[PDB]
Structure 1
Amino acid sequence: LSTEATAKIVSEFGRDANDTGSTEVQVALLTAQINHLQGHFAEHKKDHHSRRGLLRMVSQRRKLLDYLKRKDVARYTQLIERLGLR
Structure 2
Amino acid sequence: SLSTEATAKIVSEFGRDANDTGSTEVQVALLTAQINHLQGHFAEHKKDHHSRRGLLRMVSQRRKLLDYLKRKDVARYTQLIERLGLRR
| CA shift for structure 1 position 29 | 0.4
| CA shift for structure 1 position 17 | 4.3
Q: How many Å separate the matches in 2 of 1:15 and 1:22?
A: 10
Percent of aligned pairs with the same amino acid:
100
Q: Give ranges in structure 2 of 5+ residues lacking alignment.
A: none
Q: How many Å separate the matches in 1 of 2:16 and 2:40?
A: 28
Aligned length: 86
Q: Give ranges in structure 1 of 5+ residues lacking alignment.
A: none
User: Where in structure 1 do 4 or more consecutive aligned residues deviate above 6 Å?
Assistant: none
Q: Residue deviations 1:7-54, cap 9 Å, x none?
A: 101110114441001111110001111111232112112111111111
Native 8 Å contact 2:14 2:25 kept in 1:
yes
Native 8 Å contact 1:15 1:22 kept in 2:
no
Q: TM-score, normalization: structure 1?
A: 0.89
Supply the RMSD in Å over aligned alpha carbons.
Answer: 1.3
